[PDB]
Amino acid sequence: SMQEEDTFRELRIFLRNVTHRLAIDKRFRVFTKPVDPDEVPDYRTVIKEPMDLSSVISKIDLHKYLTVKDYLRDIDLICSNALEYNPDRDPGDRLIRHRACALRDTAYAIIKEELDEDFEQLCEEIQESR
Numbered sequence: 001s002m003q004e005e006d007t008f009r010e011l012r013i014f015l016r017n018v019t020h021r022l023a024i025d026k027r028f029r030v031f032t033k034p035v036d037p038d039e040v041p042d043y044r045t046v047i048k049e050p051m052d053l054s055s056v057i058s059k060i061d062l063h064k065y066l067t068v069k070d071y072l073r074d075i076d077l078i079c080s081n082a083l084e085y086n087p088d089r090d091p092g093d094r095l096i097r098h099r100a101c102a103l104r105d106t107a108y109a110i111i112k113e114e115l116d117e118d119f120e121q122l123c124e125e126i127q128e129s130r
């Protein structure tokens with residue numbers, strides 16, 4: 001229905017706002033663009049499913065996310081890709097892992113504080129019905 005399409009547009013507007021707040025945070029600058037194959041050719045071979053905040057904005061605009069649960073899976077992937085590719089005892093690696101964990105924790109805390117559980121439940125029920 002038109003009503004359900006309005007509900008999904010509402011969800012996309014909220015997801016664009018959360019993603020913009022993460023992308024302007026100086027800590028998360030490394031997560032704002034895909035890894036440049038020139039600089040890191042080792043990456044696309046170690047990392048099977050690359051994800052960054054620019055690509056998240058792309059997935060929202062293409063209607064790939066119908067639930068907050070769907071969105072958070074891609075946040076979790078940004079974080080899990082950084083921890084798996086930078087596991088070394090080495091300050092540079094420790095710094096990116098701390099920032100990746102802070103990105104994940106921030107996104108979960110915004111959604112916990114701001115979004116009503118009944119709105120997510122609604123978005124899920126429309127998804128399941130299709």
Ligand SMILES: COCCN1C(=O)N[C@@](CCO)(Cc2ccc(F)cc2)C1=O
Binds near residue numbers: 013
């Ligand atoms: C927006 O769509 C979901 C409906 N909704 C919520 O889930 N929490 C609030 C308030 C509780 O009523 C607040 C809020 C407003 C705008 C948002 F983008 C996000 C959250 C709300 O208005």
